[PDB]
Design a protein around this ligand. Structure first.
Ligand SMILES: O=C(CCCCCCC(=O)Nc1ccccc1)NO
Ligand SMILES: [Cl-]
Ligand SMILES: [Cl-]
Ligand SMILES: [Cl-]
Ligand SMILES: [K+]
Ligand SMILES: [K+]
Ligand SMILES: [Mg+2]
Ligand SMILES: [Zn+2]
Length: 357
């Protein structure tokens, strides 16, 4: 099979001991997996096994202190788990959390390996907990280790240090961790689309604004597309891809594409409040398949409406498998503030990308 799929039910074990209804539910991944079975997608994929990341692999992006603190939670008593989790912004921890975070990362390493060794062309990773808010030295926003960032470094470690990796982060939240890890790096192009609301939207930092273009040799290699003042959906995401994501990506000419694929911009998501449709996600996936000779790895991040994420991620897998993509309306006018956002990013990045000039 041309498309790989990784899913391990052991990643369900991470749970919130004090609020069993917290939206980052174990069943997020099992529901997505079940939908792949219902739609007969699973048997069309080559099944890639999950594995644990090693501590040496975590050190590709994370400090020894951070690794050690999260590792220490594996045998903590409940009171200590509660106290430790409360030291971070929006984290809960159970004794299974560390191992689940290792499995999420190792699953993605095995998927990247399968792509880069030619065993599969592309792949999807149905993993939790998510990764993109995790920083070198801290956990944040339901994330412990930065799975996508680690996977970029892991990919480089089996090919070449300078292997060009594009990370497209279409989760509705800004991947602050990923931005920071690669901020000074021109080998990893980070492009995030995210709700911003001038800082009112999590993670509530001006680091997510369009004027953060990267640092030093990384200038130009961090592209933030922030949305303000409007319920964005397919038209806006399509326009961002047309004017920004795809021209920059084609110029960068990645050798591997990782998608930080949260489905919390989806219609029905309680945290995102946006209206991207499953066909919208299919369109975006199919666009990214035109890059890197098709070498695309879709990594689950956020997304909290169980039916919505199941349908949306399954449509992405369908695209990876070669199914016919959707024809959507590129003429629908955008929300006025979306035009402003796109124009702000264009102005910020035109100094770095000839495709924008
Ligand atoms: O999807 C995410 C999760 C980021 C963490 C969001 C914290 C703020 C928030 O919306 N918290 C929340 C909302 C409803 C119920 C429980 C927590 N990142 O991509
Ligand atoms: Cl159906
Ligand atoms: Cl199947
Ligand atoms: Cl501007
Ligand atoms: K994002
Ligand atoms: K970068
Ligand atoms: Mg450049
Ligand atoms: Zn999110």
């Amino acid at each position: 099979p041309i498309t790989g799929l990784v899913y391990d039910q052991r990643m369900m074990l991470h749970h919130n001991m004090w609020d069993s209804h917290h939206p980052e539910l174990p069943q997020r991944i099992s529901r997505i997996f079940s939908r792949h079975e219902e739609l007969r997608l699973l048997s069309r994929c080559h099944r890639i096994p999950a594995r644990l990341a090693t501590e040496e692999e975590l050190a590709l992006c994370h400090s020894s202190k951070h690794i050690s603190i999260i590792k220490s939670s594996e045998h903590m008593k409940p009171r200590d788990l509660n106290r430790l989790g409360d030291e971070y912004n929006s984290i809960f921890i159970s004794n299974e959390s560390y191992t689940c975070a290792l499995l999420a990362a190792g699953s993605c390493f095995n998927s990247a390996q399968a792509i880069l060794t030619g065993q599969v062309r592309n792949a999807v990773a149905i993993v939790r907990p998510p990764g993109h808010h995790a920083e070198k030295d801290t956990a944040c926003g339901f994330c412990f280790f930065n799975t996508a960032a680690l996977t970029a470094r892991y990919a480089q470690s089996i090919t070449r240090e300078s292997l060009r990796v594009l990370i497209v982060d279409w989760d509705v939240h800004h991947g602050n961790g990923t931005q920071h890890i690669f901020e000074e790096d021109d080998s990893v192009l980070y492009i995030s689309l995210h709700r911003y609301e001038d800082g009112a939207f999590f993670p509530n930092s001006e680091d997510a604004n369009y004027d953060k273009v990267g640092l030093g040799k990384g200038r130009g290699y961090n592209v933030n597309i922030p949305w303000n003042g409007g319920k964005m959906g397919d038209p806006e995401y399509m326009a961002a891809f047309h004017h920004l994501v795809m021209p920059i990506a084609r110029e960068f000419a990645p050798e591997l594409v990782l998608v930080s694929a949260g489905f919390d911009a989806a219609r029905g998501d309680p945290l995102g409040g946006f209206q991207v449709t499953p066909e919208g996600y299919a369109h975006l996936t199919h666009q990214l398949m035109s890059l890197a000779a098709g070498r695309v790895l879709i990594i689950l991040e956020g997304g909290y409406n169980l039916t919505s994420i199941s349908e949306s991620m399954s449509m992405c897998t369908s695209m990876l498998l070669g199914d016919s993509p959707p024809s959507l309306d590129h003429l629908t006018p955008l929300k006025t503030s979306a035009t402003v956002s796109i124009n702000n990013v264009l102005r910020a990045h035109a100094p770095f990308w000839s495709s924008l000039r």
